[PDB]
């Protein structure tokens, strides 16, 4: 009875070519693909060229024009939308995913499910801090700052519905800092060092690799 | 007569075959290439045996048999012997890397002895923290930590020899090498490291070394 649908805003460049698809469809095919997630949405702007061929190479996933001006807007919407049109209840659990994340283990998308699936409070995957942090000042060092017990987040986010728009509806960053403020507080679930995000060259050579 | 760069390894795992090399073979070869590195020396313990099979593929690299109880403990003879020795004037530059990262490019070195190689408080390879951070309580999230200005430090990090015996000689609550540093009232620069400088702890880490390699 309870669904997991899967929402990633996209309204940078995930139309980038690797392999014989762009990352945004590389993104796709994980979820399409995992026997957990029962629907597929991604927003886009409504001025998306590519938009249309990804809606045709994908018939299932629902390809929605109504992105915002910022990401946070264009998730409010997206959460919005799922509760007007009935596709998604008030106790259905949305997984925000980033479109660049386009290498996530699919055995971490399971863990995620499996252990924030059924506690109210949701869960987002993350992973350890595990060299010893430096604050800066002019380039250099100003201070050494303790990492004990901090954890650098990743995403799926993993909310019930309506506990998500309620959040959103209200200085914030991920869409768990939105939940924290309410004064629920949200499980940490392990990561993968392989779920990098592509935002530079660097990462881009070790995202490529990762896709072979 | 040009002030030294002399690397120092603390590695008393790294014997985790890859390709036809372990991988300390692979991160001795980075430095024994690099033009600007004039020496590099290796601090095993003294029970280490495979060591020995490493002096014979590098016979201009030293294998020192003085490991510690612990890294603090051997970065710490390992300094000290290159000076006692004479290998190391108190101006040269040590710098010191994890016997595990074994991907650092080339590029990454190059620029870490062209900027903190000619500053007296040294530097280090470090990456600035993208992500949002978290504080944990017990594996729930209790706080979400500001980022702004924050880095991950990384390895090499370089120090003058005289600089470096000194700070780690003796509070005591400290973590890295620039950690012991910073506490003498000495400001590092922080250098631009790399995605790939990464080091080998668990299988995750292992199969995007064994990919990077090839």
């Known amino acids: 009875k309870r669904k997991n649908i899967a929402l990633i805003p996209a309204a940078p460049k995930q139309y980038?070519?690797?392999?014989?698809?762009?990352?945004?469809?590389?993104?796709?095919?994980?979820?399409?693909?995992?026997?957990?997630?029962?629907?597929?949405?991604?927003?886009?702007?409504?001025?998306?060229?590519?938009?249309?061929?990804?809606?045709?190479?994908?018939?299932q996933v629902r390809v929605w024009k109504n992105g915002g001006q910022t990401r946070a807007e264009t998730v409010r919407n997206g959460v919005a939308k799922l509760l007007e049109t009935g596709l998604a209840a008030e106790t259905d659990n949305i997984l925000v995913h980033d479109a660049a994340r386009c290498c996530l283990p699919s055995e971490a998308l399971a863990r995620l499910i499996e252990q924030a699936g059924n506690?109210?409070?949701?869960?987002?995957?993350?992973?350890?801090?595990?060299?010893?942090?430096?604050?800066?000042?002019?380039?250099?060092?100003?201070?050494?700052?303790?990492?004990?017990?901090?954890?650098?987040?990743?995403?799926?986010?993993?909310?019930?519905?309506?506990?998500?728009?309620?959040?959103?509806?209200?200085?914030?960053?991920?869409?768990?800092?939105?939940?924290?403020?309410?004064?629920?507080?949200?499980?940490?679930?392990?990561?993968?060092?392989?779920?990098?995000?592509?935002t530079q060259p660097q990462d881009a050579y070790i995202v490529r690799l990762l896709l072979d």
Do not use: C, M, Y
């Open 16 to 59: 980038v070519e690797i392999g014989s698809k762009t990352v945004l469809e590389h993104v796709l095919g994980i979820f399409e693909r995992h026997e957990a997630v029962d629907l597929t949405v991604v927003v886009v702007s409504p001025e998306d060229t590519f938009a249309d061929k990804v809606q045709t190479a994908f018939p």
């Open 119 to 198: 506690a109210a409070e949701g869960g987002i995957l993350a992973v350890p801090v595990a060299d010893t942090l430096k604050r800066a000042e002019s380039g250099q060092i100003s201070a050494t700052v303790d990492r004990s017990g901090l954890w650098q987040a990743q995403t799926p986010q993993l909310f019930q519905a309506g506990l998500l728009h309620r959040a959103l509806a209200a200085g914030i960053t991920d869409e768990a800092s939105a939940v924290e403020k309410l004064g629920v507080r949200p499980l940490l679930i392990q990561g993968d060092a392989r779920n990098l995000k592509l």
